[PDB]
UniProtKB/Swiss-Prot annotation, chain A:
Binds 1 zinc ion per subunit. In a number of structures (e.g. 4Y4O, 5FDV) a 4Fe-4S cluster is seen in place of the zinc cofactor. The keyword Zinc applies. Signal peptide: none annotated. This is Small ribosomal subunit protein uS4. The keyword DNA repair does not apply. It holds the Pfam family Ribosomal_S4. Keywords: Metal-binding, Ribonucleoprotein, Ribosomal protein, RNA-binding, rRNA-binding, Zinc. Zn(2+) binds at residues 8, 11, 25, 30. It comes from Thermus thermophilus (strain ATCC 27634 / DSM 579 / HB8).
From Swiss-Prot, chain B:
It comes from Thermus thermophilus (strain ATCC 27634 / DSM 579 / HB8). PANTHER family: 40S RIBOSOMAL PROTEIN S11 FAMILY MEMBER (PTHR10744), SMALL RIBOSOMAL SUBUNIT PROTEIN US17M (PTHR10744:SF1). Disruption phenotype: Increased generation time and a temperature-sensitive phenotype. One of the primary rRNA binding proteins, it binds directly to 16S rRNA where it helps nucleate assembly of the platform and body of the 30S subunit by bringing together and stabilizing interactions between several different RNA helices. The combined cluster of proteins S8, S12 and S17 appears to hold together the shoulder and platform of the 30S subunit. One of its GO terms (biological process) is translation. This is Small ribosomal subunit protein uS17. GO terms for cellular component: cytosolic small ribosomal subunit. Coiled coil: none annotated. Disulfide bonds: none annotated. Part of the 30S ribosomal subunit. Contacts protein S12. GO terms for molecular function: rRNA binding; structural constituent of ribosome. Pfam families: Ribosomal_S17.
Curated annotation (Swiss-Prot), chain C:
Belongs to the bacterial ribosomal protein bS20 family. Coiled coil: none annotated. This is Small ribosomal subunit protein bS20. One of the primary rRNA binding proteins, it binds directly to 16S rRNA where it nucleates assembly of the bottom of the body of the 30S subunit, by binding to several RNA helices of the 16S rRNA. Keywords: Ribonucleoprotein, Ribosomal protein, RNA-binding, rRNA-binding.
Curated annotation (Swiss-Prot), chain D:
It comes from Thermus thermophilus (strain ATCC 27634 / DSM 579 / HB8). This is Small ribosomal subunit protein bS16. One of its GO terms (cellular component) is cytoplasm. The lineage of its organism: Bacteria, Thermotogati, Deinococcota, Deinococci, Thermales. HAMAP family: Ribosomal_bS16. It holds the Pfam family Ribosomal_S16. Belongs to the bacterial ribosomal protein bS16 family.
Length: 208, 104, 99, 83
RNA sequence: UGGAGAGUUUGAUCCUGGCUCAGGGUGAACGCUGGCGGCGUGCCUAAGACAUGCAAGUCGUGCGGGCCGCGGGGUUUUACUCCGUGGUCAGCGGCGGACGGGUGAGUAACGCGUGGGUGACCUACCCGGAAGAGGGGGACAACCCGGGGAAACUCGGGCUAAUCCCCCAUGUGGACCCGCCCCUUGGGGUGUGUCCAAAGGGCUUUGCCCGCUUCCGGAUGGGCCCGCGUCCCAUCAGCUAGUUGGUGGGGUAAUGGCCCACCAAGGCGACGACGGGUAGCCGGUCUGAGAGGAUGGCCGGCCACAGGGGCACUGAGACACGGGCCCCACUCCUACGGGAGGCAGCAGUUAGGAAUCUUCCGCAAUGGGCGCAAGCCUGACGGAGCGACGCCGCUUGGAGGAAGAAGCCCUUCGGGGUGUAAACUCCUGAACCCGGGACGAAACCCCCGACGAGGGGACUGACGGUACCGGGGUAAUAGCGCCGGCCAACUCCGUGCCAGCAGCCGCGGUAAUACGGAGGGCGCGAGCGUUACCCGGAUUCACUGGGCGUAAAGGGCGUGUAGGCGGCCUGGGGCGUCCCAUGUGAA
């Protein structure tokens, strides 16, 4: 699964500006401009008061789609976030952000996270040493995350990483640019994230 | 430890044996009220000392016969017809309750 | 067919007879002792009782009886033999019983 | 007869034996009498063999015959002061 | 670290109340669809019947042989006979076949669970301690003749060995009766009397290894007894002659009415006896905020059964799944007299069914039986095979328009959608192709040392050239259900209470977002739907946590038995209740 289809149609079904096209987005075309109305032949009509249910579903879909993962796999994390100690709301995001495919997008190795899960599947990424071809691998703090030695000098790599020079990352990541590495420092806070979602809703949706 | 129950000799009508009624006072599983159940024990009485109406401690013992598995440890209090009467009348009412109310 | 652990079976039958005979001795030999005890034959009664206790402990040794089986069979013997010679007799032979 | 053997506890292609005293009649992986250590043939940890050496000499002192391939684990973890 | 509600009785309302929906679960099946691995899992029916193959043996270091050999002897030579060593076959004898593997039929029961009892007992092999083996005799198979039977097999006669059987002797010690003792259920002593021990093999042979005998402990395994717990029906209220108890005897390892002869007349029941229905119990499992409800499938413990019914033998242990006997019901052989079988062992076949797998590999690892060992046996087990049956991880990178003779839509060809969404801009490179290649395996054994002492560079891999690792490299499967409210998702055409849909309310009668297409949209994705069942919502059996003036519900009224319940004060007791310590609550 992992969707794999017209990405930018859902960029506007959900509503807010989504960044799954990578840097294809900043050039006025993550579908955002021109037509900010939902896909289909009914995109331009005034909708009605959505049931309190809808706005949960709609808010939860944003979160699932922004990290682009299976619902089957998405729900499995929410269970182990309520089961875990501490605030169930933010724990969840700490785990989404902890997924390796995302830690590669976050560390600006690939312009898109969607385009970055394929980067991992093809074993271009190491963790503390050994290769890892698993977008599901949960990075723990202290894990230095680097680019493959043999596979180092490549097309999208050389380009993407050079444009990352002169850029900083989240306070929970350090990065070495001229040696492509950088540890995973800390599980990010709710404040440390700029996510256009109200997770409290997303809990409410599953706590139905 | 061989268990030790205490109760009332409600029957002497046997050769070297006495029936001892033993009550147990326990709280109810779901409903919590305290309830009173009981059962009769056949106790081994050698020199047929313990007579009817007496209150004895019985003790778990090597088998003497079918279901007769207790020996009378020691006497506690002497006689008390009342305790037996409570038991006697319980069996009296049974004469009703049948297919009808006969002339008995 | 033919599992040659049926050798085991025919071997049992050989054994079955040995016990069956061994204790069929005790039966008709014990019976004799208490018979002579009920007439107060005393000397005969113990001369027979003595060899009957022996024949029991013997049968115990192997497999026929073993254990308390031989013991109580021995006890149920002497107990009865004595209580028959004590009905006017006096163990004046002094064979296999304590003074 | 009471023995000291290895009971299997890993998974498919992952042997994890567990060192137990048990009656020999009883099945391999059933209600054993007492566990006194573990074995890991793949040596995947720094401690791939452990055994309560005190208890071992108890059960030995009352005739627990150990398997030839479990004996070698005890000689190994110094259950006998051999030299 | 834990609790959501909605639709539906009305012209409208508030109650009451049922029905349905949203959640979680599955050893599932059915439809459409189907790429990859890993790990689990897989007759719920017929405990119906079963072809074929394999599934429990082993020991020549217990004993004597038979058959096919080969060699060395005694004789001048042959005949006759003596000794040694190969291969093979069964017999005698020891240990094991009572474990392991299978099932859920039966059982409402001390069967199971939990906690105790055993002065009421047993325990092969294993461990520790004390002591002992001297002398005689016997038999039955194998074999050797002979007879019966179609067969399965069976009968008579003769010989022989042993760690097979038996009589004497030794009595450390043990058992028995009877006593002077201490204990107190049959627990320990102690005296006189009687009674009972043994086996021999092996070598590098007079001193080592494996055995043998009696006894005391330990450990392990087990029998029996008791308290408590354990489904529904009262339209099942009375039940019971071994029935209940006693003295005595039988029997057992041991208690007991377990069994027998006599004597007494008891025992049980509304706190549910007796009868009937259903079911293997538990650890656990699903659900639930919890209290509770449902369940007992994999795995582990216990129990019961091995075509149905009954029975003993052997043994430390069996009422004995692959042992014996008898009856019955089947299926075979049958020379009609008779005989032969028992997959609920692993596969496998047929039947029934909506539905449930290979007649595969291996002794390498683990475990078990026997053996001094070498080794053997092991469908226990370790792997593989089939099935989206389950769980988890993973791929189908994605930057380019629109020509209906009955399927590219949107107002009678009209206004925009599909949608950045490619049959072709870059980039990485599942499949696939070359090469390396496992861990799992070190013991048993032989060497040095006190034939357990760091020496085994003895030998050992079914899985499997598999996994993993490195090099080469191709844009490379997407379905399914939904879109009237509950319930996320709306438009056109066809159809006119027809064809149909439908979980509940309901939609269709010519302008249908509800039927059937189409375009578009939502959900989920190697899966998606349907059916079936469990808990949930359901405070709808209300212990937490409901009710009865009119909604369902106060007995027509009384008298009173059992039971439930009980004013004020003081004192003893400590059953309920509370607290501390502790043993148990395996995995
Ligand atoms: Mg044999
Ligand atoms: Mg009405
Ligand atoms: Mg209406
Ligand atoms: Mg209304
Ligand atoms: Mg079945
Ligand atoms: Mg030979
Ligand atoms: Mg042989
Ligand atoms: Mg019944
Ligand atoms: Mg019990
Ligand atoms: Mg003969
Ligand atoms: Mg002998
Ligand atoms: Mg002698
Ligand atoms: Mg049943
Ligand atoms: Mg059958
Ligand atoms: Mg039978
Ligand atoms: Mg035996
Ligand atoms: Mg016997
Ligand atoms: Mg049986
Ligand atoms: Mg058998
Ligand atoms: Mg069989
Ligand atoms: Mg089978
Ligand atoms: Mg059929
Ligand atoms: Mg299979
Ligand atoms: Mg083995
Ligand atoms: Mg297997
Ligand atoms: Mg190795
Ligand atoms: Mg070997
Ligand atoms: Mg060594
Ligand atoms: Mg809606
Ligand atoms: Mg429909
Ligand atoms: Mg129309
Ligand atoms: Mg429609
Ligand atoms: Mg509809
Ligand atoms: Mg999946
Ligand atoms: Mg309820
Ligand atoms: Mg509830
Ligand atoms: Mg209430
Ligand atoms: Mg109500
Ligand atoms: Mg009315
Ligand atoms: Mg009314
Ligand atoms: Mg009234
Ligand atoms: Mg009162
Ligand atoms: Mg009061
Ligand atoms: Mg108290
Ligand atoms: Mg406790
Ligand atoms: Mg536990």
């Amino acid at each position: 699964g992992r969707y794999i289809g017209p990405v930018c149609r859902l960029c506007r079904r959900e509503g807010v500006k989504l960044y799954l096209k990578g840097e294809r987005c900043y050039s006025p075309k993550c579908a955002m401009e021109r037509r900010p109305y939902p896909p289909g032949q009914h995109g331009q009509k005034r909708a009605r008061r959505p049931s309190d249910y809808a706005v949960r579903l709609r808010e939860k879909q944003k979160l699932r789609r922004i990290y682009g993962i299976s619902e089957r796999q998405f729900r499995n994390l929410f269970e182990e976030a309520s089961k875990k100690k501490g605030v169930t709301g933010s724990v969840f995001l700490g785990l989404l952000e902890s997924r390796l495919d995302n830690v590669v997008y976050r560390l600006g190795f690939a312009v898109s996270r969607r385009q970055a899960r394929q980067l991992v599947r093809h074993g271009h990424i190491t963790v503390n040493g050994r290769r890892v071809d698993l977008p599901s691998y949960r990075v723990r703090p202290g894990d230095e995350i680097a680019v493959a030695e043999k596979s180092r000098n490549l097309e999208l790599i050389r380009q993407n990483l050079e444009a990352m020079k002169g850029r900083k990352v989240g306070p929970w990541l350090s990065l070495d640019v001229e040696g492509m590495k950088g540890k995973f420092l800390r599980l990010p806070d709710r404040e440390d994230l700029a996510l256009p979602v109200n997770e409290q809703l997303v809990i409410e949706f599953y706590s139905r | 430890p061989k268990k030790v129950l205490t109760g009332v000799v409600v029957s002497d009508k046997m050769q070297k044996t006495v029936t001892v009624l033993v009550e147990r006072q326990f709280p109810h599983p779901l409903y919590g009220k305290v309830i009173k159940r009981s059962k009769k024990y056949l106790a081994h009485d050698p020199e047929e000392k313990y007579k009817l109406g007496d209150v004895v401690e019985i003790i778990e013992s090597r088998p003497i016969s079918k279901r007769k598995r207790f020996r009378v440890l020691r006497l506690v209090e002497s006689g008390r017809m009342d305790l037996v009467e409570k038991y006697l009348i319980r069996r009296q009412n049974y004469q009703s309750l049948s297919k009808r109310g006969g002339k008995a | 067919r033919n599992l040659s652990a049926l050798k085991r079976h025919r071997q049992s039958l050989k054994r079955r007879l040995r016990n069956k005979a061994k204790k069929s001795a005790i039966k008709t030999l014990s019976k004799k002792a208490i018979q002579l005890a009920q007439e107060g034959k005393a000397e005969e009664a113990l001369k027979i009782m003595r060899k009957a206790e022996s024949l029991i402990d013997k049968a115990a040794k192997g497999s026929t009886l073993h254990k308390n089986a031989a013991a109580r069979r021995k006890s149920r013997l002497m107990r009865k033999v004595r209580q028959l010679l004590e009905a006017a007799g006096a163990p004046l032979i002094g064979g296999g019983l304590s003074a | 007869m009471v023995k000291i053997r290895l009971a299997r506890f890993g998974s498919k292609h992952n042997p994890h034996y567990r060192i137990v005293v048990t009656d020999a009649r009883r099945k391999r992986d059933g209600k054993y009498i007492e566990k006194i250590g573990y074995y890991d043939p793949r040596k995947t940890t720094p401690d791939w063999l452990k055994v309560d050496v005190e208890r071992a000499r108890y059960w030995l002192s009352v005739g627990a015959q150990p398997t030839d391939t479990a004996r070698r684990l005890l000689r190994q973890a110094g259950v006998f002061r051999q030299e």
